[PDB]
């Protein structure tokens, strides 16, 4: 159950695998008002940009658990490049099978793909009244019918939760949402459009590869499928939750 060729082929140039932009991650760490030293656990650190960049701006400590590459010296050298490899640590580990030395103040997991979600680990290693950063997808605009949804590339509307229904889901789970950074059309266009050019280059790079057909097909509808439905429907964003905990009374 690997990753579909198309996805990987049409995202090999992306520096961010979701609608978020540099300005967005930058803002995130800002609104979080984290004091220097705040330890952070980041599952799915990937490039390690978030942790690295925050480490230099808000001056914090942290550790990323990447599950997308054999060696993660691409991020380890990233912290060195920013002169902060003494604060941010990285480990080639895949989610489960992990226990932190000491709890942290911010546990993040934006999720690999913007479509997927992933938390015991996130909660087991988070200090009481800690912030839990989670990137989740939602319906920016609830499609009028399954028809439009199925077109966007989704079984039923019931697959995604609407924004108000998403904040309603966190509350019913005992979670107290205290922050929210949502992506915008611009963020999305950058993410979705960047693919169209990447595929068109791939074709000019491997014309003899019998897969050019699947790319050609994808390209021929990619921009159409996006502007016609997805653009207005698909929504994404990162929520900062803080679980309601009962105390000694």
Residue ranges in 184-203 that form contacts with its own copies under rule CB under 8 A: 184-186, 189-190, 193-194, 196-197, 199-200
Residue with smaller CB distance to its own copies, 89 or 231: 231
Considering the rule CB under 8 A, would residue 179 count as an interface residue with its own copies?
yes
Q: For residue 185, count other CB atoms closer than 10 A to its CB.
A: 11
- C-alpha–C-alpha distance, residues 116 and 110, integer Å: 9
From residue 40 to residue 79, the character string flagging contacts with its own copies as x (rule: CB under 8 A) and all else as - is ----------------------------------------
From residue 205 to residue 234, the character string flagging contacts with its own copies as x (rule: CB under 8 A) and all else as - is --------------xx--xx--xx--x---
- C-alpha–C-alpha distance, residues 229 and 153, integer Å: 10
* 3-state SS class at 146: helix
> Least distance from C-beta 192 to its own copies, angstroms?
8
**DSSP alpha helices (H): ranges in the chain?**
5-9, 22-31, 49-57, 73-81, 120-124, 146-152, 163-171, 185-205, 212-225, 231-233
Q: Which stretch binds its own copies (CB under 8 A): 38-46, 51-59, 75-83, 168-176?
A: 168-176
Q: For residue 59, count other CB atoms closer than 10 A to its CB.
A: 14
- Choosing from 164, 206, 213, 217, the residue that interacts with its own copies (CB under 8 A) is 164
Residue ranges in 81-140 that form contacts with its own copies under rule CB under 8 A: 129
Q: Provide φ and ψ at 145, rounded to 5°.
A: -165, 160
- C-alpha–C-alpha distance, residues 219 and 100, integer Å: 44
Residues that bind its own copies (CB under 8 A): 13, 27, 31-33, 129, 163-164, 166-168, 171, 176-182, 184-186, 189-190, 193-194, 196-197, 199-200, 204, 219-220, 223-224, 227-228, 231, 240, 242
């Amino acid at each position: 159950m690997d990753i579909p060729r198309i996805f990987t082929i049409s995202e090999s140039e992306h520096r961010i695998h979701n609608p978020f932009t540099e300005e967005k991650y930058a803002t995130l760490g800002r609104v979080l008002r984290m004091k220097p030293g705040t330890r952070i656990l980041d599952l799915g650190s990937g490039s390690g940009e978030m942790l690295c960049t925050w480490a230099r701006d808000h001056g914090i400590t942290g550790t990323g658990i990447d599950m997308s590459s054999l060696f993660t010296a691409q991020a380890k050298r990233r912290a060195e490049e920013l002169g902060v490899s003494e604060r941010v640590h990285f480990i080639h580990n895949d989610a489960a099978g992990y226990v932190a030395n000491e709890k942290c103040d911010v546990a993040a997991c934006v999720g690999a793909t913007w479509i997927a979600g992933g938390e015991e680990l996130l909660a087991q290693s988070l200090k009481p009244g800690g912030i839990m950063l989670i990137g989740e997808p939602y319906w920016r605009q609830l499609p009028a019918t399954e028809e439009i949804a199925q077109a966007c590339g989704v079984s039923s509307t019931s697959d995604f939760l609407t924004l108000p229904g998403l904040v309603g889901a966190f509350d019913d789970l005992g979670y107290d949402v205290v922050e929210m950074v949502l992506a915008d059309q611009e963020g999305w266009d950058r993410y979705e459009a960047a693919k169209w050019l990447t595929m068109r280059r791939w074709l000019e790079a491997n014309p003899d590869d019998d897969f050019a057909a699947e790319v050609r097909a994808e390209l021929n509808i990619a921009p159409k499928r996006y502007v016609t439905y997805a653009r207005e429907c698909f929504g994404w964003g990162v929520f900062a939750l803080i679980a309601r905990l009962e105390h000694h009374h």
